[PDB]
Design a binder for these strands. Sequence first.
RNA 1: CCUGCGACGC
RNA 2: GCGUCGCAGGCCUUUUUAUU
DNA 3: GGGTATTCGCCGTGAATAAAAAGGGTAC
DNA 4: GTACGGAAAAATAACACGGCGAATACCC
Lengths: 98, 74, 1331, 49, 50
Amino acid sequence: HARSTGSYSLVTQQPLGGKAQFGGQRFGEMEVWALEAYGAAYTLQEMLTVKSDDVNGRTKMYKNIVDGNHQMEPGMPESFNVLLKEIRSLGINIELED
Amino acid sequence: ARVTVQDAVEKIGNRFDLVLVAARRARQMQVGGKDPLVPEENDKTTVIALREIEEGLINNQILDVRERQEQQEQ
Amino acid sequence: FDAIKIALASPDMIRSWSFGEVKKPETINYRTFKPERDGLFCARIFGPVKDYECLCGKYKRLKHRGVICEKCGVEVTQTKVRRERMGHIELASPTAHIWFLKSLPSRIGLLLDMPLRDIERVLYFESYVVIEGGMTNLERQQILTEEQYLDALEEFGDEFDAKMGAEAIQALLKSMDLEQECEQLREELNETNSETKRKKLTKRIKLLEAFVQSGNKPEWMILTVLPVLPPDLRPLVPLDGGRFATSDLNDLYRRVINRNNRLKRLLDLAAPDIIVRNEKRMLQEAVDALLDNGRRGRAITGSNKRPLKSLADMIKGKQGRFRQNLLGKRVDYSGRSVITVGPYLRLHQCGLPKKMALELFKPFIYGKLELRGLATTIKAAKKMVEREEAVVWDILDEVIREHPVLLNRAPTLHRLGIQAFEPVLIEGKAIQLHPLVCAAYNADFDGDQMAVHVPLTLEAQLEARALMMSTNNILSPANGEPIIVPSQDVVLGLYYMTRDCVNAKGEGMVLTGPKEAERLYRSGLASLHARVKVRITEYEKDANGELVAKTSLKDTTVGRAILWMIVPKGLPYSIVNQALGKKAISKMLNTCYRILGLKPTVIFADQIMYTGFAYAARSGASVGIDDMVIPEKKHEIISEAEAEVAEIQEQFQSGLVTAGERYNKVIDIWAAANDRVSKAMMDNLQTETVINRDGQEEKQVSFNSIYMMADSGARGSAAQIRQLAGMRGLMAKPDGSIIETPITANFREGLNVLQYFISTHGARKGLADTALKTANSGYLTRRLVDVAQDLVVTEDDCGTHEGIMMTPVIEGGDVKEPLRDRVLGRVTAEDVLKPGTADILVPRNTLLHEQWCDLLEENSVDAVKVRSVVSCDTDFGVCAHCYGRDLARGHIINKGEAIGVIAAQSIGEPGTQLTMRTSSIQVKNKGSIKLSNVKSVVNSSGKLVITSRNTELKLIDEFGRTKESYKVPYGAVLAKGDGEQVAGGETVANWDPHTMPVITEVSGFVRFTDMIDGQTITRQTDELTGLSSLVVLDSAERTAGGKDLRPALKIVDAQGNDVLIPGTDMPAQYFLPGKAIVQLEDGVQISSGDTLARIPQTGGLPRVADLFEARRPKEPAILAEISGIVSFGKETKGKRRLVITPVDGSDPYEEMIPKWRQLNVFEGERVERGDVISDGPEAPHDILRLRGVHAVTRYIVNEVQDVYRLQGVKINDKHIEVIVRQMLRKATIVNAGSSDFLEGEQVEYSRVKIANRELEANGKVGATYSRDLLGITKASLATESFISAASFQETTRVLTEAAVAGKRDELRGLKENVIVGRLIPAGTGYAYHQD
Amino acid sequence: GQNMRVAFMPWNGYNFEDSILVSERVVQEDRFTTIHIQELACVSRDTKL
Amino acid sequence: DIVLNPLGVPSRMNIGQILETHLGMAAKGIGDKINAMLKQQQEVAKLREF
RNA sequence: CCUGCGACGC
RNA sequence: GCGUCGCAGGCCUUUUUAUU
DNA sequence: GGGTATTCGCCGTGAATAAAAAGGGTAC
DNA sequence: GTACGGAAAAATAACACGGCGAATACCC
Ligand SMILES: [Mg+2]
Ligand SMILES: [Zn+2]
Ligand SMILES: [Zn+2]
């Protein structure tokens, strides 16, 4: 099985799972720990934001790879916004201050 | 080709800033279109930047004074 | 952005979050897909359903943006606002929050100082409570029943107020001042002598101060306004049949809205109280089922007999948002296939299929086709790629030549499971992997799969090429051993090539070089094993970098000369002239990497693998039925064993020996028969050759394929050959014992049914242990990672002088690790002095490499004080001098490396190799003994007795170092003194077991004081004539008239006067404890050392799991908390009383000991802080609070290494010291002086260090603290960061404490930066944060 | 299954850990060709309009 | 047809595959002798007694 | 909101 | 070199099997 | 009657992924 | 064939280990 781009979910904007749905591989917690054991910080940031969650980030990354530029924008993952909206529905006030 | 990068690690202090310096050098050739110092042999900008680190013609201070001369020129 | 802030939510904030109010329970129509007017799926509240179109019509356009329609009132905007807008439910009655009520400890129960059961009775309409009764008999908070409220109404009608439900709790929480109550609690805390009352008072004061410092109100816990979720986060999916299936949250919201509408409709019609009480109770239960379904009562099930999912189930657990959507995600540009072997590949490249490379590199080929001009439109490039034209493969080969890929296996136990390789376009559907990385990947080719990943940015490609390349990772970071060791085929080929026989073709001819040897081998004129004379030319770089050549005639074989062409110039010839096994090739690669470097070592390993795969095929090694030979003396050994078993059974049948001695003798003779069978088999398999040199025979090493595969170290060990050729031996039972009938056959001949059914027990036990170890190993690895994720090297030298003392560990049999394996790669703390003269041998801040180890091993040095990680004074991280080396390179540890993650991955990786299922000493060599911590007295016979509790018996050889170490009990005698030496092999110390005698220091007349017959002593006559002794009765089953009567043996002289002890002014009397049998009646002149009284009496992975969790053992060894004289007290029919009386200060100490435990402590002794009272496993908390930090650090390190040494696992000590430092991070305040801390609160160690440093800099007094120990689970939850504590375990109580405390959480770590999706402060991200 | 002529020897690392070297005559004779049958349905339901 | 590796035989103790290999070789030898007798024009009595 | 498909404008 | 029209898709829980 | 101090409930925890079915509101 | 969604029978079902807090019983 192999995949560059494809369909995404509704609630959490992530790639699907399975060969029949044309899904992608899962980068679990142990792979994150193995990347943290190296000095590979940009690879983990690319795996966590552009390749998985950030819609604007992955569209700008696709346009930059098509144009020929190897540069990405971190942005904000959508799963963190889903987590904030789900914790905020329990009557607990959590927000990013600046 | 660059199988090992030990001569690039021997120049700068550790291996972590080597990635940042080589990325800052490689972004000038693909986006800025600057001509490299070492003659390329069917290589991408990563291998050219690593060879420029290995030959000792590129470091942090050289890129800093080159950016300073570019700011003073324009 | 800045730090994360979490607090309580006011109802005004909930109304400000919302955009509308939901009033109808229905979600959507079934016949029409349009949303409802005012429902859970709305258009005028949450947003429109389609992009820039309203609901009613006429506004489906782009020029109208953000306008409000007049028909339905739907804002014309994007659909993306539907996943962020919220609503609210105006409840007719207040409800209590289930998180601040049911999660122990209860926040409402601690604030109101009320038990949880009474609040549960009041909230769920089962009892009454008075609120501000005034001048009445009832107090401020009293729990009234149903009848007591009627009595209070009919007795006190006016000036009375009692409510039932959440309104009473809201009125209690609203009418309460925090400052006055906190001041009253402080003034009550000053007049407090109890312990647990003081604990509850400090907990209530800390909760009140948490409510005061935070901006929240105590009445905000009672829910008034209820917010809802956006509809895109809980959508209604369509089905093929047309029926719209519902979710759990939509059903719970519909239930809550329907019950609230029923309550409003019933309150409109002015109902009586009985029905509306049940309606408010049902609304409370519906709100509690919506918030957390399963905490209170029974979880409601719908149509599945399964509990429904609430708002709390989506956050915690394995299927929550943290562990399934934030800590581990699904990524793009990735693939998966079955792996195969590529022999032609190099160490830095791998074989990638073209069908996977065409899919993983789509936009690169698109950009190259748009750049070259072959496709101007992106659709034309997509059709050109889908048609698979000729130039598409050329573009794909162009965009793959120097673009690495990340190959990864499914179990990632350490960092070598994700390595970078260069793709080679192959034909097929399998991935070709290099054979040398299979030992690091732990993956064979029987059906294993691996995942690939494609970096895209320049920084990711540079991190893959510089940090994650397979040529850069050749040493393991756990211990420093290589990971590019050759496997079975390469060592088999290099073992077959480098051998010799006494007679072959071409033996005894002079050769001019290795090229003539290769020519003679490939021409067929000389054999591969033929002793010849080859002129070699080896180089040596013993000068200042330059290489010196030499030429001489060597006596070698033909194959070693051919292998000499593979060996580079810097290596000598003496490393290849022997038979190459496995450790020989390993030390050859070690010598090549040590002398030459990294770049020739990769080419050397590749050429070694190439020549091994080339010369393993020319041999033709094969197994057969004739290779596994049978010893000719096996049948006669079985005959003598059966004759001995028959003789032992005939002796047992007569009645001379018991059944256990018979079984033990049978086991020993069968073990001896198995050892003789194995010895005869190994003797038959060694030589097995009668070959003529010229005309006479000569023995040589066997060329059997089984012996060549077992001797070279390719595959199999000696036990496998014993089970294949000799008898299998004794086999165990599932109950744990050993069957007396062994397996006298092998796998070559036919086994019967019983010998197979016996071995099925051990096979099933091993399979079940292997299947059940992996979950505990993964749990321990996850706990170690989450407890050691925030330790990054931030400095270089903090300037400290503390450190641990490195000594080689001695148990009593032999040594295991010398000083060199424990001191290598560590910076010393103090100057190591020469044993002869006090001059400085080595400075302090020196990295001890192998040359310093060779200099220290020749000067007879045993104790080297080095700097440790736990003794570092760096705030929020460590320095580069207290850690040591990198353990994968030759330099020092860099600034920015995450040393905690590699430590947790180094400890948690070999957990799959551990286990889960449950009188005299003899010296080894000749040397003088060293007696330390011993108080003795010379007896009359010339022996040497011990009058101390603990005594260290160490052996000092002629070199001046410590080789052995033993432990002797209290009552023992020594065969020789301390001055003379031991010849070796004789008994030095001997003692009788199961006895506890008392030894006197003086010799004189013995008198009986306070000893009356019939009450405290029992004179029994044994039936044997030898035993007629007196027994002292225990002080529990005695009568009431002799509770204070305690016997004692005063020692006087022959003249009757009381002799004294030299040094003090107390009589030399010895009291008798319970069940102490004395010898005889007094009246005999005893000697100095006499026997007076006679007193009779989990390892593996759970051991490491209990050691890292700081778990208290079942039978802890009680120690002495304070120094002084031991004294027993009056017991209270349960536990035994004991009190330690000091010599100078007062006695603020009193403890109890359980009477059923054994105490090896007499009445009057002299103990100090550190000595033990009983015998058993110790607890690390007592070692920390009594001895110190370094003692419990060495204890944990030695107890972990003793478990990890039994399985043959090499793990460095710094990785355990990282977990030891992470276990102790908090401190308990003893006396807070001029500080904002309380008396008995727990703060961080670095925070109180910074506070004491600032108070010392400002000229004020500091604070006295005490460090405490916590497990790997407790330290992960007791952290200042609430995000890392909620994502690991127990999300509900962590979020509850963060809500009631108002915590502001800065990231400052790896896991917090993983969640928000940015660069972690490690590696390149550390330099990014610095710049 | 099928029974074929077998040999136990290392061949240039192509049977390294557990790998199996198969000749081309096994592929030419088609003695390991299997037939796999799938099922694709098309449900025509009755709905509105 | 298939070349296997003999390295897994001492480590993983399954000696029955080598006995199956030898017995299949003997069975194929008997079958090739029967096929060589049937390929040439032979009578029924010699084939029956073999 | 994002993918893939079919059609049309400058 | 993009924008407009129409079609299909984005799930949840449980059970079983297989692999590492 | 205050200060302990054993018991006894209760909650949290128990590895990581690919395929193939079955069911998504039942009552009066 | 549309419409409130609860609690009591169900001829229900039923883990081992560990830490923390509350009811409660000893000991002067
Ligand atoms: Mg396998
Ligand atoms: Zn409208
Ligand atoms: Zn330090």
